[PDB]
Design a protein around this ligand. Structure first.
Ligand SMILES: *[C@@H](C)[C@H]1/C(=C/c2[nH]c(/C=C3N=C(/C=C4\NC(=O)C(CC)=C4C)C(C)=C\3CCC(=O)O)c(CCC(=O)O)c2C)NC(=O)[C@@H]1C
Ligand SMILES: *[C@H](C)[C@H]1/C(=C/c2[nH]c(/C=C3N=C(/C=C4\NC(=O)C(CC)=C4C)C(C)=C\3CCC(=O)O)c(CCC(=O)O)c2C)NC(=O)[C@@H]1C
Ligand SMILES: *[C@H](C)[C@H]1/C(=C/c2[nH]c(/C=C3N=C(/C=C4\NC(=O)C(CC)=C4C)C(C)=C\3CCC(=O)O)c(CCC(=O)O)c2C)NC(=O)[C@@H]1C
Ligand SMILES: *[C@H](C)[C@H]1/C(=C/c2[nH]c(/C=C3N=C(/C=C4\NC(=O)C(CC)=C4C)C(C)=C\3CCC(=O)O)c(CCC(=O)O)c2C)NC(=O)[C@@H]1C
Ligand SMILES: *[C@H](C)[C@H]1/C(=C/c2[nH]c(/C=C3N=C(/C=C4\NC(=O)C(CC)=C4C)C(C)=C\3CCC(=O)O)c(CCC(=O)O)c2C)NC(=O)[C@@H]1C
Ligand SMILES: *[C@H](C)[C@H]1/C(=C/c2[nH]c(/C=C3N=C(/C=C4\NC(=O)C(CC)=C4C)C(C)=C\3CCC(=O)O)c(CCC(=O)O)c2C)NC(=O)[C@@H]1C
Ligand SMILES: *[C@H](C)[C@H]1/C(=C/c2[nH]c(/C=C3N=C(/C=C4\NC(=O)C(CC)=C4C)C(C)=C\3CCC(=O)O)c(CCC(=O)O)c2C)NC(=O)[C@@H]1C
Ligand SMILES: *[C@H](C)[C@H]1/C(=C/c2[nH]c(/C=C3N=C(/C=C4\NC(=O)C(CC)=C4C)C(C)=C\3CCC(=O)O)c(CCC(=O)O)c2C)NC(=O)[C@@H]1C
Ligand SMILES: CCC1=C(C)/C(=C/C2=NC(=C\c3[nH]c(/C=C4\NC(=O)C(C)=C4CC)c(C)c3CCC(=O)O)/C(CCC(=O)O)=C2C)NC1=O
Ligand SMILES: [Cl-]
Lengths: 167, 160, 164, 67, 158, 593, 161, 161
C-alpha cells in the first residue's frame, strides 16, 4: 500500500466518500512524486556505493563489529551485513516510491528483531548504519538539487523506530 | 512515550546526542505545544458537550440504541458514554504528548478482543469516534482539529 | 517490454489485464515515439562513444586484455561495448530493463570470469563510456539513456565499493 | 484413474543453476487427468516444448468409470 | 495501482525500480490530478447516478428483489449501488482496481450466492449504472471511468 | 508495539571441520556413519598429530611470518589505518590457515577468502597475492619440504591463494514467487558455509539401493521420518511405479501426500490451517511466506479438500522451479537459501522436528496478528494468564501443546480488564463482599473461599488465626494475610508454579483482579525474587490497591477479569450485541412471491 | 478422530478388559440412533447452503458487522464468514454422524479461538451465529434430531467460549 | 513468449544489429494501434462470459456433439469445453494486446493438438467454434479491432489444423 491505497482503504473501512482533505493529500503526494522518482533513480544508480559506504562508516564509528568479538567480523558475516544494508536500502527506496511504510511493515519489520536476536546481530549498529544511509541519500539528494529532503527522511526513521528498543 | 521521548530513544539506541534534524522536530513540537495546550484546555472544558454531540450525530435514533441494540439497557449506554470519555481523553493525551504511543499502550491493546468478546459493534464505534473527531474539528477550528483528528484516525485505524 | 510484463503478470493469476495495466500500456505507447527518437540518437552516436570510451579507458588502465597487442581482443572489446549500448537502446524501445537483463546482465559476471576478462576493468570501461556518453549526446537525452548505463554499471561494483 | 503419458522439456529462463540446483528438464511422466491441465499450463508458463501427450490409462469417450 | 505492482515485480526479480518503471510511475504521478478531478465529479454525481441507474435497472429488469414489494430488499440494493459507486470512485482515484478488487470483486459472487441475489441482475444493474455514469461524464471522463465499471461487471458476470 | 513471532535458538555454521561434515552427511542420511565415513574420521584423527604440530610451529613463528610479508607500498602514503588493516589481514590469513590445518578442512579459508578480491581495494591485490606467496614460501622455508606435511602446507596456502584470486561471485537469489512474496538475495559465502544437504535425484537407470535411498529420503521429507522399516510403508504399487521408467518423483510425492498415512500423521490430528502449514513443510520445504499464500491454500482446501491442496503444492510453479520432476523436496532453511524475516519464528519452529508437537497454527496467528493491534494478554506471554475459575492455578504449559503467542508490551502499557462494578448493579455485587455475611464464621469461610477458591480441609485450617479473629485481636486484613502466609497456600499457589505465574495468581486471589502491565508484574516479580513468598504476600496485602478496595475489615473479592474470562462466562454468547432478526425474509423464499 | 464406538473401545482398552455391559448398552443406544443420525446428516447435506443462508440472515445480516468497519465488510470477508459457517455446519454434522465431538475438537476447536483473536474475528458473533444455526437446523428436522445435532453446535460454542 | 516489441528486438538482436527503419515503422504501427488494442482487450475482459455463451450457442448447441454419445455430453465435459473456451478467449486477448501470437504458440498450440487427439476431442468442431467466437467478437467490437483479434483467432484455428 502506497499513500493513495492506504488512504483509500481507510475511507473504505469507515464508509466515507472522498472529502476535500483527501483530495488535497492525494494531490500533494502526486506533486511530490516527481521528487520521489528522482530519488529512486539516484538510489538505483548509486545503491551499492551508498549501502557499502554506510557499512564502512558504521564499522569506522563502531569499531568492534569488524573486531573478532563482533557479529560482522569474518567476510561471511561482513557480506551478510552488507547484503542486509542493501535490503534496507532497497525496501526504503520502495517506500520512497510508494510514500508509505506498508512495504516496510510487511517486508522489513515482519520479524527483523526476532532474526537479529536469534543470530546475535546487534540491533543498534544496524539502525546506526540505517541512519548513515539516510544521511548519505540526504546529502546526494541535496547535491542533486532536491530541496525537499523530507520524503527521504521517513522510511529510515520508520525502520529505526520499529527496530530500536525503549530507553 | 511522547515526541521528545521517541526522539531521545531513537538517539539513545545509537548512543549519540540528538542530531540537527531531530532538533528541528523538537522545534516543531516546541512551537506546536502552545496550541496543543489550548486545545487540551478547551477539550477538558467541553468533554461532556463533545461526547453528547458525538452520540447525537452518529449513534442516536438507530437500532443500536433501540431494544435488542448494544446501546440499550441504560448501564450499556453508560458504558458506551464512558468509552467515549476514554476515547476523547486519550486522544487529548495523544495530542498533548504528540505521539500515539499512549493510544497503543492504554487504549488499543486488547480493545478489539474486549469489544468482540462483549459483542460491542466495532464499526459503529469507529463511526462514533470519527463523529467525535468532527465535533472537535468543528468546535476547535480546522487549525486545532487537524492535530487531534490525526490521533482520532489512529484510533479508527487500530479499531478497524 | 511493458506489454510483455503485463501479459506475464496477468496470465500468472489467470486473469484479464486490469484497467490500470491498460493505462500503463497506453501511456507507454504515447511516449513510444519519443523513446524511438531517443533510440535514434543512440543509434547515430554509438560508435563515437565507443571509440572515445575505449581511448579513455586504455589511457586510464593499460593492463587490459584489449590493450595487449592482439587485434581480436581489441575488436572484441569494441564489439562488447557496442552490444551493450544496443541493449540499452532495446531497453529504451521495450519500456523496461528486460533486454539488458535477459540479453546480457543475467549470467554476465560468470560469462566474463570464464572468458578471463577482469570485471573491475569492465566496470572502469563502462564508467568511461558513461562519461563520454554524458558529455557527447545532450542534456535531456542523457537522462533517458545514462540510467541504463548505470544499471549495467551497478552489477559489477559489488565485490565492495572501496572506503578507507 | 485415467493417466496421461507426457514427454516434455521445460527450460529455465529466469535462474542460473550453480552446480546442484540443476536437476533435468526432459521428463517423461505419468500425469493424472485432474492435474494434467494445470501441468500443461505450468510447463507452458515456464516455457516448455511439449512433444508427446498420450492417454496412458483409460479410454476415449468414457461417460463413466474413467477414474 | 501501477506503482505497488511495479514495486512487487522489482521485489520478485530482485533489483531496484529501473528507469522504464520509473517513467511509468512518473506518468502515473502526472495523470494523478485528472483522476482526482473526475473523482470529485463522481462524488458530486453519485446520488443521482444511483437514482437514474436504479430506474433504468428496473426498466430493464423488473423481476428483481429490489423491484419487489419489500422495501428492505430495495434499500439493500440501493445501498449496494451507492457502495459500488464509492468503490468505483476509489478505483478511479487509485488508477487501478485495487480498492475495487479488494472490497467489491473478490468474494462478491460468493456473497450474492449466499444471499441468493442473482448475479446477472447485479451485473445488469452495474451496466445501467455504467450508462448513467458515462452519460453524466465527459468523453475522456467516460474513457477513464467505464473500464472500472467493466471490471466490476465482469467480476460478477458469471 | 507489534506481536512477536518467536526468536528461536539458531546456530549458524560459519564453516565445516572434517568431523562436522561427516556427521552432517550421516545425519542428513539418517544412518550411522559407514566404513568410509569411519575411515574419514579415523584418518583425519590420525593426521591430527601432524596438523596440530603444523599449527604449533606456524603460531610460534607468526610474528616473523607476518614481518616478512609489484610495487611495494609506502607506509606514509598508504595511511596508518590502512597499514594497520594490511598487517591485521596478513596475521588474520595466517591464523585462518592454522585454523584450517587443525580443522582439516579448507572450508573456513574458502568461505572467508573467496569473495575478498574486491573487499580488499583490488588495486593492492597484486601486493596481496605477492605477500601471501611470500608467506607460503617462508612457512615452507622453516617446515622441511622433502616429502613431509610441507606438501600439505603448500596445498593449503595454494587453496588460500586460489580462493582469493576468484573474482566477484554471484550472490544467490531466492526470487519472489508471487506479488505477495518478497525476493531475497544470498551471499555465496553464506551458501558455502551452510550445511551440505543431499539432493536426492531419482533417475530411471539408478541401482536399486540408490533408488531405495531416494525413497527413504522421500519418506523423511514427507512423513518426517523413515517409515520404510514399518509395514505401513507397504505402498508397493507407488514404489514399483516409481522405480522403473515411469511414475517419477513428483508423482510419487503426490501419491505420498494423498495417502492415508499422511492423513493420519498431519491431517487427522490437526485443524485445516496447521495442516496447511505442515503440508507447506512437507511438499515445498518451506513455510508460509505470507498471509495471501495461506488465503489461497485455505480457500482451496475449503472447497476441494486437502488432497487438492497437496495436488496444488506439488503442481505449483515453485515446486517445479526448485524440485523439478525427479528431485525429492528438501528443507529450505538457513544456509540452503536466503531466509525471510517475515516467517522467521514460525518457519524455524516448523523445520524443527517438534513441529507436529504444536497444534495451534503458528503461521496464520503471527501473520494475521502482526496486522492487528496488541492483544489482551499478560505481558510475559499468554502462558502467564491463569484460568478464571473459582479455584485452581491453571496455566497453559509451555511444552504440553504449545499455543504460545509472544507479544512485547511496553513498561507503561496497561491491560484492559472487564470490571464487575460498571457491569451488573449494586446489591448485586455487594452479595459477594463479606465485610467484617455479618456472622464472624461466614467471614472466615469467605476469606478461605477467596484465598483458596473452595473451602479447605481441617489440616489446611489456620485455627490460631480463627481464634485471634474471633477474639478481635486481629482484623480481617490480618486474617487474610495469615491465610496467604499459611503453608497450604504456598503449596497451592507458589511451589508448583512458575514464579511470575505464581505472583500473578496470588495477585488475582489477594486483589481480585489481574495485573495491568509490566509496572505491577515487574515489581511483584522483583519482590518475590529478591525477598521471597511471604514478602510478596505482605507487599500485596499492604499494597495500596488492597487498602483502597478491600480496606482492613473486608474480605477480598473478584473485581476485574480478562475479557477471555467473560467469554468463558458466556458460552451462549453475550446478552444483546445487536437486535436479532427473528422471522426474517430471504431471497428465494420471498421470490417465490 | 474417536467416534462413540472408538472412544468406548479406548476406555475399555485403557482399562484392559472387554467392553463391559454398560458400554455395550451405550453402543446399543448408538446403534439404534444411527438411522435417524444418517437421515439427519442426509437432510443437512441436502440443505447446507440454505441453512447457512438463513442463519446468516437471522444473525449476521443487517447489523453493524456487515457495515463498513464491521468484520463482514469487504466481500471476500463476507465469503470467509460464509465458508466458516459451512465448516461449522459440516463438521458438526460429522460429529453428529459420528456420535462424538472429537472431530470438532481436533479439526475445528483446537486453535480456532487463537486464530479468531489473531485475525480479530468476532468470537461472540460467531457464537451467536452458531446458536442461530442450531435454531435453523432445529426448525426443519424436528425436536429430537435437532437437539442431537445442537449438542454439537453447543459444543462449538463452548470451544469458542 | 514474444510480443510485437520483443519479436522486433529479438529479430534485430539475433543479427547484432540495432532496430532499422522498417522495424522502427513497424513498432510505430504497434504504438499507434495500442489504444484500440487496449480498448478491445477491456471490452473482451468485460464480455468474456457473454462471448463464450453466444459462441457455444451458435456453433456447438443442438447438434449431436451435445446429446448422448457427443463429446460435450456428460456436463463435466461441457464444462471442460467451456474452460477451454475461456482460455482461448483470454489468450487471444493476450495475443491481440501484445501484438504477437507467440503467446498462443507457447501456451496453446504446444500440447493442445496431442491432448485433443489423446482424448478424442474433435479438433474440427473446436476450430469451427473458435472461429464462431471470432465472428462474435467481430459482431460486437467492430470491423477493425474485431479483425485484429480475429487474426489471432485465425492463428489458433490454423495451429490446430
Ligand atoms: C549489518 C547490517 C549488521 C549485521 C548483519 C547480519 N545479518 C545476518 C543474517 C541475516 N540477515 C537477515 C535479514 C533479512 N531478511 C529479510 O527478509 C529482511 C528484509 C528484506 C532482512 C533485513 C536474515 C534473514 C539473516 C539470516 C541469514 C540469511 O541470509 O538468510 C548476518 C549473519 C548471521 C550469522 O552469523 O550467520 C549478519 C552478519 N551484522 C552486524 O554486526 C551488523 C550490525
Ligand atoms: C420523558 C419522560 C423525559 C424526556 C425524554 C427524552 N428521552 C430522549 C431520548 C432517549 N431516551 C432513551 C431511553 C432509554 N434507553 C435505554 O436503554 C433505557 C432503558 C429501557 C431508556 C429509558 C433513548 C434510547 C433515547 C434516544 C432515542 C433512541 O432510541 O435512539 C429524548 C430525546 C433527546 C434528544 O436530544 O433527542 C427525550 C426528550 N424528556 C423530558 O423532558 C422528560 C423528563
Ligand atoms: C460506545 C461508543 C459503544 C459501546 C460501548 C460499550 N462498551 C462496553 C463495555 C466495556 N468497554 C470497555 C472498554 C474500556 N475500558 C477501559 O479502561 C478503556 C479505556 C482505554 C476502554 C476502551 C470495558 C473494559 C468494558 C466492560 C466494563 C463496562 O461495564 O463498561 C459496553 C457494555 C457491553 C455489555 O454490557 O455487554 C458497551 C455498551 N457499545 C455500542 O454499541 C457503541 C458503539
Ligand atoms: C442491487 C444492485 C441488487 C440487490 C441487492 C441486495 N443486496 C442485499 C444484501 C446485501 N448486499 C450487501 C453488499 C455488500 N457487502 C460488501 O462488503 C459490499 C462491497 C463493499 C457490498 C456491495 C450486504 C452486506 C448485504 C447484507 C445486508 C446488509 O446490509 O447487512 C439484499 C438483501 C437480501 C436479503 O435477504 O436481505 C438485496 C436484495 N437486489 C436486486 O434486485 C439487485 C440485483
Ligand atoms: C472426581 C469426580 C474426578 C477427579 C477430580 C479431581 N479434581 C482435582 C483437582 C481440581 N479440580 C478442580 C476443579 C474445579 N475448579 C473450579 O473452579 C470448579 C468449577 C468451575 C471445578 C470443578 C481444580 C481447579 C483442581 C485443582 C486444584 C484443587 O485441587 O483444588 C483432582 C486433583 C488432581 C491433582 O493432581 O491435583 C482430582 C483427582 N478425579 C477423578 O478421577 C474423578 C473422575
Ligand atoms: C463468520 C461466522 C464470522 C467471520 C469470519 C471470518 N473468518 C475469517 C478468516 C479465517 N477464518 C479461519 C478459520 C478456520 N481455520 C480452520 O482451520 C477452520 C476449519 C475448521 C476454520 C473455521 C481462518 C484460518 C481464516 C483466515 C483465512 C481466510 O481469511 O479465509 C475472516 C476474514 C478475516 C480477514 O481479515 O480477512 C472472516 C470475516 N467474521 C464475522 O464477522 C463472522 C461473525
Ligand atoms: C429444465 C429442468 C430447466 C431448463 C432447461 C433448459 N436446458 C437448456 C439447454 C441445455 N441443457 C443441457 C443439458 C445437459 N447436457 C448434459 O450432458 C446433461 C447430463 C446428461 C444435461 C442435463 C444442454 C447440453 C443444453 C444445451 C442445448 C442442447 O441440448 O443442445 C435450455 C435451453 C436454453 C437456451 O436458451 O438455449 C433450457 C430451457 N430451463 C429452466 O428454466 C429449468 C430450470
Ligand atoms: C471445446 C471447444 C471442445 C471440447 C473440449 C474438451 N476438452 C477436454 C479436455 C481437455 N482440454 C484441455 C485443454 C487445454 N490444454 C491447454 O494447454 C490449453 C490452454 C490454452 C487448453 C485449452 C485439457 C488440458 C484437457 C484435459 C484435462 C482437463 O479436462 O481438465 C474435454 C474432456 C475430455 C474427456 O474425455 O473428459 C473436452 C470435452 N469438446 C468438444 O466437443 C468441443 C469442440
Ligand atoms: C580469511 C580471513 C579474512 C580476511 C583477511 C578478511 C578480509 C577483510 N579485510 C578487509 C579490508 C581491507 N583489507 C585491506 C588490506 C589488505 N588485505 C591483505 O591481505 C593485504 C596484503 C592488503 C593490501 C595491503 C584493506 C586496505 C582493507 C580496507 C577495509 C575497508 O574497506 O575499510 C575487510 C573489511 C572489513 C574491515 O575493514 O575489517 C575484510 C572482510 N575477512 C576474512 O574473513
Ligand atoms: Cl587435508
Amino acid at each position: 500500500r502506497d499513500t493513495v491505497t492506504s488512504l483509500i482503504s481507510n475511507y473504505d473501512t469507515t464508509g466515507r466518500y472522498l472529502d476535500r482533505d483527501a483530495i488535497d493529500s492525494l494531490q500533494s503526494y502526486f506533486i511530490t512524486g516527481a521528487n520521489r522518482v528522482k530519488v529512486a533513480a539516484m538510489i538505483s544508480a548509486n545503491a551499492a556505493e551508498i549501502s557499502r559506504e554506510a557499512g564502512k562508516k558504521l564499522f569506522e564509528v563502531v569499531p568492534e563489529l569488524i573486531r573478532p568479538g563482533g557479529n560482522a567480523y569474518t567476510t561471511r558475516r561482513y557480506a551478510a551485513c552488507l547484503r542486509d544494508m542493501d535490503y534496507y536500502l532497497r525496501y526504503s527506496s520502495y517506500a520512497l516510491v510508494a510514500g508509505n511504510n506498508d512495504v516496510l511493515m510487511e517486508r522489513v519489520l515482519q520479524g527483523l528483531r526476532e532474526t537479529y536476536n536469534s543470530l546475535g546481530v546487534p540491533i543498534a549498529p544496524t539502525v546506526q548504519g540505517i541512519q548513515i544511509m539516510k544521511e548519505m541519500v540526504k546529502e546526494r539528494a541535496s547535491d542533486m538539487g532536491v530541496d525537499d529532503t523530507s520524503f527521504i527522511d521517513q522510511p529510515f526513521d520508520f525502520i529505526s523506530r520499529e527496530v530500536s528498543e525503549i530507553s | 512515550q511522547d515526541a521528545i521521548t521517541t526522539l531521545i530513544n531513537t538517539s539513545d539506541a545509537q548512543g549519540k546526542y540528538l542530531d540537527d534534524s531531530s532538533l528541528d522536530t523538537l522545534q516543531e513540537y516546541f512551537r506546536s505545544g502552545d496550541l496543543r495546550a489550548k486545545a487540551a484546555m478547551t477539550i477538558s472544558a467541553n468533554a461532556s458537550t463533545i461526547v453528547t454531540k458525538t452520540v447525537a450525530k452518529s449513534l442516536l435514533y438507530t437500532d443500536i440504541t433501540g431494544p435488542g441494540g448494544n446501546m440499550y439497557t441504560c448501564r450499556r449506554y453508560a458504558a458506551c458514554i464512558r468509552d467515549m470519555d476514554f476515547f476523547l481523553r486519550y486522544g487529548t493525551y495523544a495530542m498533548l504528548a504528540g505521539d500515539a504511543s499512549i493510544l497503543d499502550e492504554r487504549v488499543l491493546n486488547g480493545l478489539k478482543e474486549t469489544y468482540n468478546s462483549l459483542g460491542v459493534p466495532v464499526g459503529a464505534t469507529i463511526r462514533a469516534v470519527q463523529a467525535m473527531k468532527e465535533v472537535v474539528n468543528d468546535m476547535l477550528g480546522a487549525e486545532a482539529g487537524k492535530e487531534v483528528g490525526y490521533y482520532f484516525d489512529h484510533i479508527c485505524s487500530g479499531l478497524s | 517490454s511493458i506489454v510483455k510484463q503485463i501479459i506475464s503478470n496477468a496470465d500468472e493469476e489467470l486473469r484479464y489485464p486490469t484497467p490500470g495495466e491498460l493505462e500503463m500500456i497506453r501511456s507507454f505507447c504515447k511516449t513510444g515515439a519519443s523513446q524511438i527518437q531517443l533510440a535514434k540518437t543512440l543509434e547515430s552516436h554509438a560508435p563515437t562513444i565507443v571509440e572515445r570510451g575505449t581511448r579513455k579507458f586504455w589511457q586510464i588502465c593499460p593492463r587490459t586484455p584489449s590493450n595487449s597487442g592482439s587485434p581480436r581482443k581489441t575488436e572484441a572489446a569494441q564489439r562488447d561495448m557496442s552490444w551493450y549500448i544496443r541493449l540499452i537502446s532495446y531497453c529504451l524501445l521495450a519500456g523496461n530493463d528486460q533486454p539488458l537483463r535477459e540479453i546480457g546482465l543475467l549470467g554476465m559476471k560468470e560469462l566474463y570470469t570464464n572468458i578471463g576478462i577482469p570485471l573491475d576493468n569492465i566496470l572502469q570501461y563502462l564508467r568511461c563510456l558513461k562519461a563520454e556518453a554524458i558529455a557527447l549526446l545532450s542534456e535531456a537525452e542523457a537522462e533517458a539513456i545514462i540510467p541504463y548505463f548505470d544499471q549495467i554499471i551497478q552489477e559489477l561494483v559489488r565485490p565492495g565499493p572501496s572506503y578507507f | 484413474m485415467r493417466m496421461f503419458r507426457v514427454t516434455a522439456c521445460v527450460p529455465s529462463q529466469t535462474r542460473i543453476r550453480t552446480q546442484r540446483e540443476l536437476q533435468n528438464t526432459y521428463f517423461t511422466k505419468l500425469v493424472p487427468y485432474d492435474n494434467w491441465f494445470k501441468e500443461q499450463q505450468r510447463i507452458q508458463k515456464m516455457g516448455g516444448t511439449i512433444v508427446k501427450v498420450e492417454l496412458a490409462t483409460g479410454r476415449r469417450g468414457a461417460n463413466t468409470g474413467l477414474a | 495501482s501501477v506503482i505497488s505492482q511495479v514495486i512487487a515485480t522489482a521485489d520478485r526479480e530482485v533489483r531496484y525500480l529501473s528507469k522504464g518503471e520509473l517513467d511509468a510511475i512518473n506518468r502515473f504521478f502526472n495523470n494523478g490530478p485528472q483522476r482526482l478531478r473526475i473523482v470529485s465529479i463522481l462524488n458530486s454525481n453519485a446520488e443521482e447516478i444511483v437514482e437514474k441507474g436504479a430506474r433504468r435497472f428496473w426498466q430493464r429488469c423488473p423481476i428483481t428483489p429490489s423491484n419487489s414489494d419489500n422495501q428492505q430488499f430495495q434499500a439493500s440494493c440501493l445501498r449496494d449501488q451507492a457502495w459500488f459507486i464509492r468503490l468505483i470512485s476509489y478505483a478511479v482515484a487509485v488508477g487501478d482496481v485495487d480498492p475495487l478488487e479488494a472490497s467489491g470483486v473478490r468474494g462478491v459472487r460468493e456473497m450474492y450466492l449466499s444471499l441468493e441475489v442473482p448475479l446477472r441482475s447485479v451485473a445488469l444493474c452495474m451496466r445501467s449504472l455504467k450508462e448513467v455514469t458515462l452519460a453524466m461524464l465527459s468523453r475522456e471522463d467516460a474513457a477513464e471511468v467505464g473500464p472500472y465499471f467493466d471490471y466490476l461487471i465482469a467480476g460478477l458476470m458469471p | 508495539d507489534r506481536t512477536n513471532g518467536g526468536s528461536p535458538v539458531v546456530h549458524p555454521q560459519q564453516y565445516h571441520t572434517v568431523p562436522t561434515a561427516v556427521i552432517n552427511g550421516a545425519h542428513q542420511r539418517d544412518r550411522y556413519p559407514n566404513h568410509s565415513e569411519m575411515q574419514t574420521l579415523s584418518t583425519f584423527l590420525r593426521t591430527g598429530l601432524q596438523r596440530l604440530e603444523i599449527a604449533q610451529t606456524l603460531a610460534q613463528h607468526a610474528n616473523e611470518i607476518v614481518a616478512a610479508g609489484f610495487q611495494a607500498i609506502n607506509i606514509a602514503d598508504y595511511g596508518a589505518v590502512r597499514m594497520k588493516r594490511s598487517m591485521r589481514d596478513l596475521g588474520w590469513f595466517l591464523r585462518y590457515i592454522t585454523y584450517a590445518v587443525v580443522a582439516g578442512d579448507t572450508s573456513i579459508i574458502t568461505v572467508n577468502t573467496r569473495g575478498l578480491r574486491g573487499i580488499i581495494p583490488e588495486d593492492v591485490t597484486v601486493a596481496t597475492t605477492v605477500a601471501l606467496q611470500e608467506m607460503q614460501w617462508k612457512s615452507l622455508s622453516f617446515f622441511p619440504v622433502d616429502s613431509a606435511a610441507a606438501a600439505l602446507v603448500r596445498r593449503y596456502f595454494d587453496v588460500l591463494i586460489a580462493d582469493y584470486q576468484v573474482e566477484k561471485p554471484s550472490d544467490r537469489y531466492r526470487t519472489g514467487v508471487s506479488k505477495h512474496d518478497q525476493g531475497l538475495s544470498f551471499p555465496e559465502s553464506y551458501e558455502d558455509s551452510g550445511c551440505a544437504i543431499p539432493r536426492w535425484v531419482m533417475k530411471p537407470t539408478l541401482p536399486d539401493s540408490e533408488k531405495d535411498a531416494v525413497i527413504r529420503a522421500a519418506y523423511r521429507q514427507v512423513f518426517e521420518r523413515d517409515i520404510s522399516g514399518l509395514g505401513t510403508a507397504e505402498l508397493t504399487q507407488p514404489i514399483s511405479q516409481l522405480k522403473g521408467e515411469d511414475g517419477s518423483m513428483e508423482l510419487f510425492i503426490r501419491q505420498l501426500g494423498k495417502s492415508r498415512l499422511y492423513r493420519q500423521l498431519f491431517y487427522e490430528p490437526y485443524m485445516i490451517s496447521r495442516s496447511i502449514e505442515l503440508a507447506c513443510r512437507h511438499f515445498l520445504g518451506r513455510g508460509l511466506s505470507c498471509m495471501e499464500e495461506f488465503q489461497r491454500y485455505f480457500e482451496l482446501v475449503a472447497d476441494q479438500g486437502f488432497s487438492a491442496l497437496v495436488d496444488a503444492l506439488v503442481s505449483s510453479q515453485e515446486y517445479a522451479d526448485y524440485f523439478g520432476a525427479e528431485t525429492v523436496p528438501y528443507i529450505r532453511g538457513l544456509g540452503i537459501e536466503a531466509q525471510a524475516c517475515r516467517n522467521w519464528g514460525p518457519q524455524l519452529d516448523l523445520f524443527k522436528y517438534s513441529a507436529p508437537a504444536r497444534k495451534v497454527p503458528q503461521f496464520v496467528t503471527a501473520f494475521a496478528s502482526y496486522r492487528q493491534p496488541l492483544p489482551n494478554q499478560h505481558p510475559y506471554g499468554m502462558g502467564n494468564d491463569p484460568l478464571e475459575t473459582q479455584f485452581g492455578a491453571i496455566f497453559p504449559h509451555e511444552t504440553t501443546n504449545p499455543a504460545a503467542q509472544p507479544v512485547h508490551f511496553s513498561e507503561d502499557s496497561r491491560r484492559i480488564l472487564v470490571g464487575h462494578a460498571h457491569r451488573k448493579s449494586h446489591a448485586e455485587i455487594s452479595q459477594q463482599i463479606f465485610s467484617l455475611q455479618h456472622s464472624v464464621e461466614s467471614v472466615i469461610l469467605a476469606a478461605y473461599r477467596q484465598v483458596f477458591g473452595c473451602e479447605v480441609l481441617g489440616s489446611q485450617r489456620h485455627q490460631a488465626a480463627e481464634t485471634q479473629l474471633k477474639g478481635g485481636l486481629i482484623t480481617v486484613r490480618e486474617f487474610v494475610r495469615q491465610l496467604a502466609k499459611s503453608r497450604s497456600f504456598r503449596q497451592a499457589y507458589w511451589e508448583n508454579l512458575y514464579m511470575t505465574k505464581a505472583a500473578e495468581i496470588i495477585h488475582r486471589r489477594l486483589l481480585g483482579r489481574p495485573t495491568y502491565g509490566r509496572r505491577e508484574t515487574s515489581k511483584y516479580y522483583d519482590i518475590c525474587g529478591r525477598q521471597g513468598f511471604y514478602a510478596l504476600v505482605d507487599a500485596l496485602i499492604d499494597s495500596d490497591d488492597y487498602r483502597t478496595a478491600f480496606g482492613e475489615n473486608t474480605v477480598p473479592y473478584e473485581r476485574y477479569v480478562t475479557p477471555r474470562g467473560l467469554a468463558l462466562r458466556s458460552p451462549k454468547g453475550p446478552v444483546a450485541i445487536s437486535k436479532l432478526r427473528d422471522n426474517p425474509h430471504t431471497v428465494g423464499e420471498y421470490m417465490m412471491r
